[PDB]
Structure 1
Amino acid sequence: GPSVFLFPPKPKDTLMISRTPEVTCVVVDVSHEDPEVKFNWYVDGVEVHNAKTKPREEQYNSTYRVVSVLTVLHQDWLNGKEYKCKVSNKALPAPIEKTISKAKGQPREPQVYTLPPSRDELTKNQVSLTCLVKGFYPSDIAVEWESNGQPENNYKTTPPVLDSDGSFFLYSKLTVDKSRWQQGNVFSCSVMHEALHNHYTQKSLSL
């Protein structure tokens, strides 16, 4: 009958105490006929009861999409606890169980390197400010940019890439008007990862 997909929290949400990390259990292909969907949640096998189901919404293909959101403690996810979502529905021979947890392996600290634009790029009105982050593990990481204390938002970051030593790397590219760079403005690449002190570091870049 229905299918289940279990999603982890965003890397930033488990690293910053200001955020509230959530695990999301998504059920699709729930029929009109058998619409009842029951969720059971366990952390390392112990059932938990703070899960909240969101309003379901019928889909363009005439099935129900039902979602249960489970808030989790930052420490538990980081310390490897297993989150299991149990979904019960009448169209199933049996309940479907999906499990997720942080990747295993010793965490490795990211090295953060800011790189100015290539001189060849100065012929354009916009330049690229680059932030290379390498040697980190697990691949869960968050990267942002700011200037003067405010958030530079015109950036894009590549997904993590597995390196030859088993760690990961990525590049974040912030695009700014060439004038802003030429004027001496200072930019900062902020990186959040479990293996960094305070789960946070910043590296500046300026002319």
Structure 2
Amino acid sequence: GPSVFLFPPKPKDTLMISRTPEVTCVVVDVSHEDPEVKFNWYVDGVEVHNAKTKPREEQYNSTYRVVSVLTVLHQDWLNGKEYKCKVSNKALPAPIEKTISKAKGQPREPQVYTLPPSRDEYLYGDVSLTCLVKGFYPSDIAVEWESNGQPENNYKTTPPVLDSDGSFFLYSKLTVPRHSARMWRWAHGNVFSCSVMHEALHNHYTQKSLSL
């Protein structure tokens, strides 16, 4: 039968006051003849009913997509708090109860740095640029780039992984194509760096420059 899960907030929005993360509860695969549904948001089993629900969207599955946004002040998520999206329908006789929340352990201050590409990896075409992080905890983290104060968008990255150190580690790729704005600065060796955000970070932020 059908089944549905929710979506957590974005670390880029968390740990940043002005930003507004969003605990989101998506719903899909409505019944061709029994699609009705309504939400109820609980806090450890405490209803608030203060969410903003959105319309529907059809899909190639001949069904509709439903979702509602939930407001955040970050505190209760910063110190720890569980949420619960209660939904329903007729195709399924049971309600929903999911114990999604922040986790806790031994927080690790991100061990951070920058590194160039390899002489041999120069080739011709889309060169790579990277920036790595390890010794951090937990896995909820996302980072971005900055360039002389200006941003970059053509980047990508990877999820974290565990090892014997009891922490996490990963890198972020940055595509840098030929005859483009991504490399003009690099060849000219200006301020490149990695904008990182994480809980264990002192002031919840650090940074590392990069150039030739």
Taking structure 1 as the reference length, what is the TM-score of the superposition? 0.89
1:12 deviation in Å? 1.2
Query: Matched residues in 1 for 2:22 and 2:67: separation?
Result: 12
1:184 and 2:195 equivalent?
no
| Conserved 8 A contact 2:41-2:85 | yes
1:175–1:60: structure 2 CA closer, same or farther, 3 Å change rule? closer
Query: Matched residues in 1 for 2:15 and 2:162: separation?
Result: 21
Paired residue total: 204
- Indicate the residue corresponding to 1:198 in structure 2: 203
1:175–1:56: structure 2 CA closer, same or farther, 3 Å change rule? closer
Deviations 1:126-185 (A, max 9, x none): 543321100111101121111111012232211112222221111112344xxx323221
Query: Matched residues in 1 for 2:129 and 2:29: separation?
Result: 44
1:53–1:183: structure 2 CA closer, same or farther, 3 Å change rule? same
Aligned residue for 1:181, secondary structure, equals: helix
Which of the two has greater strand per residue? 1
Q: State the percentage of identical aligned residues.
A: 97
Deviations 1:93-128 (A, max 9, x none): 221222310123132111111012222234546543
| Conserved 8 A contact 1:32-1:64 | no
Unmatched segments (≥5 aa) in structure 1 = none
| Conserved 8 A contact 2:109-2:202 | no
Aligned residue for 2:39, secondary structure, equals: strand
Choose 162-171 or 132-141, whichever is displaced more: 162-171
1:45 deviation in Å? 2.1
Query: Matched residues in 2 for 1:165 and 1:95: separation?
Result: 40
Choose 142-151 or 119-128, whichever is displaced more: 119-128
- Indicate the residue corresponding to 2:141 in structure 1: 141
Query: Matched residues in 2 for 1:185 and 1:125: separation?
Result: 21
Query: Matched residues in 1 for 2:119 and 2:130: separation?
Result: 13
**RMSD over equivalenced CA pairs, Å:** 1.9
1:181–1:98: structure 2 CA closer, same or farther, 3 Å change rule? same
Taking structure 2 as the reference length, what is the TM-score of the superposition? 0.87
Query: Matched residues in 2 for 1:165 and 1:28: separation?
Result: 39
Unmatched segments (≥5 aa) in structure 2 = 177-184
| Conserved 8 A contact 1:114-1:129 | no
Deviations 1:60-86 (A, max 9, x none): 223232212212221222222001011
- Indicate the residue corresponding to 2:180 in structure 1: none
1:2 deviation in Å? 4.7
1:39–1:119: structure 2 CA closer, same or farther, 3 Å change rule? same
| Conserved 8 A contact 2:10-2:21 | yes
1:152–1:27: structure 2 CA closer, same or farther, 3 Å change rule? closer
| Conserved 8 A contact 2:113-2:131 | yes
1:154–1:173: structure 2 CA closer, same or farther, 3 Å change rule? same
1:182–1:35: structure 2 CA closer, same or farther, 3 Å change rule? closer
